[PDB]
Amino acid sequence: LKNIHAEIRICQKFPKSTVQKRFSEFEELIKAASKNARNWKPISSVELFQGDSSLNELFEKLVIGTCELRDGELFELTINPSNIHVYKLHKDGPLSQSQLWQLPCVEFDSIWENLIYDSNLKNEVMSYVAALARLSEKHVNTKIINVNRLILLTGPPGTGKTSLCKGLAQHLSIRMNDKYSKSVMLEINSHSLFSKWFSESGKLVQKMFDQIDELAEDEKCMVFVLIDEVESLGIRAVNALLTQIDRIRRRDNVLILCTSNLESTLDKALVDRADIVKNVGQPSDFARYSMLKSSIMELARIGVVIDNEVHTDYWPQDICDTKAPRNEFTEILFKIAQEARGLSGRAISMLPTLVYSKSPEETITLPNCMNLFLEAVKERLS
Amino acid sequence: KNIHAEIRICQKFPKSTVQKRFSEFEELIKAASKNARNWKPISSVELFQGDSSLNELFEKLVIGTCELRDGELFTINPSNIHVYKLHKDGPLSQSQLWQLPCVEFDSIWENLIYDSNLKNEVMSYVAALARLSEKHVNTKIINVNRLILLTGPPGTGKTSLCKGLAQHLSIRMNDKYSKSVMLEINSHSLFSKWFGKLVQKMFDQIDELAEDEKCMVFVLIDEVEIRAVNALLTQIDRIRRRDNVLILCTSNLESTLDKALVDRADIVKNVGQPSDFARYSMLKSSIMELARIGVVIDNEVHTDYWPQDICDTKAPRNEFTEILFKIAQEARGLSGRAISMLPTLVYSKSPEETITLPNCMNLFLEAVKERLSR
Ligand SMILES: Nc1ncnc2c1ncn2[C@@H]1O[C@H](COP(=O)(O)OP(=O)(O)O)[C@@H](O)[C@H]1O
């Protein structure tokens, strides 16, 4: 496939100066890792029969991803060394000032891979926003070609729009790391803390955006602006906000992301200002299963769910495309997903800890796990 | 299927010698299990038979299981059986910091009485959050906020439940956590009135304590009900991210202030109907308020014989407290809101504008029966 990217996280103790010098060894790693890899699914180690274990001394985690393939697809390759980016995440943490995030940070790193959708939504947003960023970096005339530098995600509260914005900025900061030396993200109104004072109205919306502006005045640095619960905000201040929004988007090295927890009453002013408006719905039956399966598999990783009676093949597998014979356990779990139609994405993430409390035993058997999960679902719906 | 055991040991005896006699403890707990109450303490004195040497070591033992009801009267793991040693004097103010398990919190869990099996549900759920956290479950796959909000009227002993919960967790997670510490903020509603800069400071000290991975950190914020609030919520997040911490919150409002915290909470549990002991607390609080005002004045009866706090459910009770508890039983149906409005009706019945303690009891009792009817 023509354009595929690779993100590689090195150690802090690994000197960045030597990276370009040992760049050849990284490319060998990527060739070996691609022999068995899933799209956008991170590999943390090169195991036996997959290549020299000395390749493990190079990286902490690598991701190989493309927008040409489905979100989970396995590869079957030609990767230009310009699309492979090496990075180290900052652990500095969020700062009070409206929270400032240093990108890429430790907190955002595992978001993207764990976001589950059935509509190829992740690929669509990723590729489109990358195009907006790529164009903007190349200083496109806004008059000739219309680039708003704003993106809007809408849907119910449980769909994880914020997580999309976090993870999206995480990837873009790495993707564009050759173009930008430093990358920051400013998050506003998380959650609805800003809105009440904003409803009361104040002058400091200007003051807040003026600081973003200074950070935007800094070139070779891209800034991300996330705005949560937009309609909780949007009244003298909403004009200042929109005016301040307009000032910010004019910069080439800036990108603003909005999320609206309300559906079907979108503010006309924001839709008009958006490059793209994406609706994120509550997960479908296939997506619900995927989340439930991921929860169980994670519960098994930490040793919460252990069962030696049933083997890996018999364990619930990926149910994608109905291309494999659905195991009864795979089927029973799917039946649970059918019972969990009302539950949101966040609610499904909440389910495991409720299941854990119900279980008497310190460790849950797989057959009982299915039974407990079903009970929690029913209890959560009531 | 799931049973734990906790054992308090005298400050004298070392921790190794107890480990040597550990096997004897297992055989002892099984024997003590035969005749026992769930989640109720068994004293060393209770059984003189067996070893005086083994009984010299421990002060009391508590056997608890979440599958059984609270007081029911009816299978051992060395890990499931824990061994704790009380911190004699750990309350220091700055907000307060507690070293767990402490002596003060040690007897409160057994004195909490709910009609709704509330203790077991909360115990089980918070334990699940504690275990999941300790195993470092990925947040992005399985969402664990490690923040818990408990809501109910001022008489239902919410903050005590949090204290007793953190006490038992430090003992249950004894093997995983070497040290356990709890910070209690805003008890009660004191920090907002104070004018801050201190909230950033005290939370920074928690961060320092929470830096130790072996340490277990509890943060209890009670009476939760613009710049100071944001700063408080931000600090909550930085702690919330840590794997070794747990945030316990109590609110007097059932549902008025939801947006900020409810979303952050793993679970929001309501206490439910007030128990007999809860309604007693609300009735006593009203009478003392009427006394402070000057509505209820009695110079014949001394302060010792006035209604007192029932800290121990089986301790001796004064004649007046025994009466007020009876009246609290009389009002089984009334909600917390109804009981808090009774004093107005009580004062209405009194012709004297000034009320003695015996007449205060009679008028409260009448007011209770009239509001039940109507
Ligand atoms: N599609 C999904 N896949 C995996 N987890 C999800 C999904 N949707 C929601 N979640 C979980 O629910 C939470 C919702 O996060 P957030 O982005 O704040 O939701 P929203 O932006 O819709 O309010 C996330 O932390 C995530 O763990």
PDB file of N, CA and C and ligand atoms in Angstrom, chain A residues 114-117 156-163 259 261 291 345-346 349, chain B residues 139-140 143, ligand 1:
ATOM      1  N   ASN A 114      -7.709   1.825  21.800  1.00  0.00           N
ATOM      2  CA  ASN A 114      -8.783   1.280  22.618  1.00  0.00           C
ATOM      3  C   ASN A 114     -10.144   1.869  22.270  1.00  0.00           C
ATOM      4  N   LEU A 115     -10.150   2.856  21.382  1.00  0.00           N
ATOM      5  CA  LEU A 115     -11.401   3.403  20.877  1.00  0.00           C
ATOM      6  C   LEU A 115     -11.985   2.455  19.835  1.00  0.00           C
ATOM      7  N   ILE A 116     -13.234   2.046  20.046  1.00  0.00           N
ATOM      8  CA  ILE A 116     -13.866   1.036  19.199  1.00  0.00           C
ATOM      9  C   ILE A 116     -15.106   1.539  18.465  1.00  0.00           C
ATOM     10  N   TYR A 117     -15.046   1.523  17.139  1.00  0.00           N
ATOM     11  CA  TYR A 117     -16.180   1.914  16.314  1.00  0.00           C
ATOM     12  C   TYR A 117     -16.369   0.919  15.177  1.00  0.00           C
ATOM     13  N   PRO A 156     -24.418  11.623  21.415  1.00  0.00           N
ATOM     14  CA  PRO A 156     -24.701  11.391  22.835  1.00  0.00           C
ATOM     15  C   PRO A 156     -23.425  11.443  23.678  1.00  0.00           C
ATOM     16  N   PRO A 157     -23.558  11.712  24.987  1.00  0.00           N
ATOM     17  CA  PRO A 157     -22.410  11.852  25.894  1.00  0.00           C
ATOM     18  C   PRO A 157     -21.545  10.595  26.036  1.00  0.00           C
ATOM     19  N   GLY A 158     -22.105   9.417  25.790  1.00  0.00           N
ATOM     20  CA  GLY A 158     -21.379   8.185  26.052  1.00  0.00           C
ATOM     21  C   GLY A 158     -20.529   7.660  24.909  1.00  0.00           C
ATOM     22  N   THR A 159     -20.456   8.417  23.819  1.00  0.00           N
ATOM     23  CA  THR A 159     -19.821   7.937  22.594  1.00  0.00           C
ATOM     24  C   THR A 159     -18.304   8.123  22.569  1.00  0.00           C
ATOM     25  N   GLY A 160     -17.792   8.991  23.434  1.00  0.00           N
ATOM     26  CA  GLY A 160     -16.355   9.185  23.540  1.00  0.00           C
ATOM     27  C   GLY A 160     -15.771  10.134  22.512  1.00  0.00           C
ATOM     28  N   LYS A 161     -16.437  11.267  22.312  1.00  0.00           N
ATOM     29  CA  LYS A 161     -15.974  12.276  21.368  1.00  0.00           C
ATOM     30  C   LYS A 161     -14.694  12.945  21.851  1.00  0.00           C
ATOM     31  N   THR A 162     -14.620  13.185  23.155  1.00  0.00           N
ATOM     32  CA  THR A 162     -13.444  13.798  23.755  1.00  0.00           C
ATOM     33  C   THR A 162     -12.222  12.917  23.543  1.00  0.00           C
ATOM     34  N   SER A 163     -12.383  11.619  23.791  1.00  0.00           N
ATOM     35  CA  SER A 163     -11.296  10.657  23.620  1.00  0.00           C
ATOM     36  C   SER A 163     -10.773  10.659  22.188  1.00  0.00           C
ATOM     37  N   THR A 259     -16.580  19.468  20.723  1.00  0.00           N
ATOM     38  CA  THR A 259     -17.481  18.344  20.925  1.00  0.00           C
ATOM     39  C   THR A 259     -18.796  18.832  21.523  1.00  0.00           C
ATOM     40  N   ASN A 261     -22.282  17.403  23.304  1.00  0.00           N
ATOM     41  CA  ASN A 261     -22.952  16.247  23.891  1.00  0.00           C
ATOM     42  C   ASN A 261     -24.433  16.187  23.533  1.00  0.00           C
ATOM     43  N   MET A 291     -16.366  -4.189  22.754  1.00  0.00           N
ATOM     44  CA  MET A 291     -16.017  -3.577  24.028  1.00  0.00           C
ATOM     45  C   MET A 291     -16.042  -4.603  25.153  1.00  0.00           C
ATOM     46  N   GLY A 345     -21.333   3.822  25.519  1.00  0.00           N
ATOM     47  CA  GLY A 345     -19.956   3.369  25.472  1.00  0.00           C
ATOM     48  C   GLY A 345     -19.273   3.507  26.816  1.00  0.00           C
ATOM     49  N   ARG A 346     -19.510   4.630  27.485  1.00  0.00           N
ATOM     50  CA  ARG A 346     -18.945   4.855  28.809  1.00  0.00           C
ATOM     51  C   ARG A 346     -19.501   3.845  29.799  1.00  0.00           C
ATOM     52  N   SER A 349     -17.877   0.565  29.634  1.00  0.00           N
ATOM     53  CA  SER A 349     -16.574   0.632  30.285  1.00  0.00           C
ATOM     54  C   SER A 349     -16.711   0.547  31.799  1.00  0.00           C
TER      55      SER A 349
ATOM     56  N   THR B 139      -6.846   2.000  32.094  1.00  0.00           N
ATOM     57  CA  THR B 139      -7.991   2.888  32.232  1.00  0.00           C
ATOM     58  C   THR B 139      -8.795   2.989  30.935  1.00  0.00           C
ATOM     59  N   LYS B 140      -8.101   2.987  29.802  1.00  0.00           N
ATOM     60  CA  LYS B 140      -8.748   3.245  28.517  1.00  0.00           C
ATOM     61  C   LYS B 140      -9.582   2.069  28.015  1.00  0.00           C
ATOM     62  N   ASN B 143     -12.796   1.585  32.334  1.00  0.00           N
ATOM     63  CA  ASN B 143     -12.781   2.900  32.966  1.00  0.00           C
ATOM     64  C   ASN B 143     -12.930   2.816  34.479  1.00  0.00           C
TER      65      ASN B 143
HETATM   66  N1  LIG C   1     -16.175   3.756  21.195  1.00  0.00           N
HETATM   67  C1  LIG C   1     -15.569   3.579  22.393  1.00  0.00           C
HETATM   68  N2  LIG C   1     -14.601   2.654  22.564  1.00  0.00           N
HETATM   69  C2  LIG C   1     -13.996   2.474  23.755  1.00  0.00           C
HETATM   70  N3  LIG C   1     -14.294   3.182  24.860  1.00  0.00           N
HETATM   71  C3  LIG C   1     -15.250   4.143  24.832  1.00  0.00           C
HETATM   72  C4  LIG C   1     -15.954   4.398  23.563  1.00  0.00           C
HETATM   73  N4  LIG C   1     -16.837   5.383  23.798  1.00  0.00           N
HETATM   74  C5  LIG C   1     -16.710   5.732  25.104  1.00  0.00           C
HETATM   75  N5  LIG C   1     -15.766   4.997  25.723  1.00  0.00           N
HETATM   76  C6  LIG C   1     -15.383   5.131  27.151  1.00  0.00           C
HETATM   77  O1  LIG C   1     -16.235   6.118  27.736  1.00  0.00           O
HETATM   78  C7  LIG C   1     -15.509   7.291  28.111  1.00  0.00           C
HETATM   79  C8  LIG C   1     -16.146   8.513  27.460  1.00  0.00           C
HETATM   80  O2  LIG C   1     -15.132   9.486  27.231  1.00  0.00           O
HETATM   81  P1  LIG C   1     -15.462  10.921  26.582  1.00  0.00           P
HETATM   82  O3  LIG C   1     -14.614  11.048  25.340  1.00  0.00           O
HETATM   83  O4  LIG C   1     -15.359  11.954  27.681  1.00  0.00           O
HETATM   84  O5  LIG C   1     -17.009  10.818  26.129  1.00  0.00           O
HETATM   85  P2  LIG C   1     -17.803  12.077  25.501  1.00  0.00           P
HETATM   86  O6  LIG C   1     -16.738  12.912  24.833  1.00  0.00           O
HETATM   87  O7  LIG C   1     -18.768  11.436  24.536  1.00  0.00           O
HETATM   88  O8  LIG C   1     -18.462  12.750  26.686  1.00  0.00           O
HETATM   89  C9  LIG C   1     -14.071   7.104  27.658  1.00  0.00           C
HETATM   90  O9  LIG C   1     -13.173   7.378  28.736  1.00  0.00           O
HETATM   91  C10 LIG C   1     -13.958   5.655  27.231  1.00  0.00           C
HETATM   92  O10 LIG C   1     -13.225   4.917  28.213  1.00  0.00           O
END
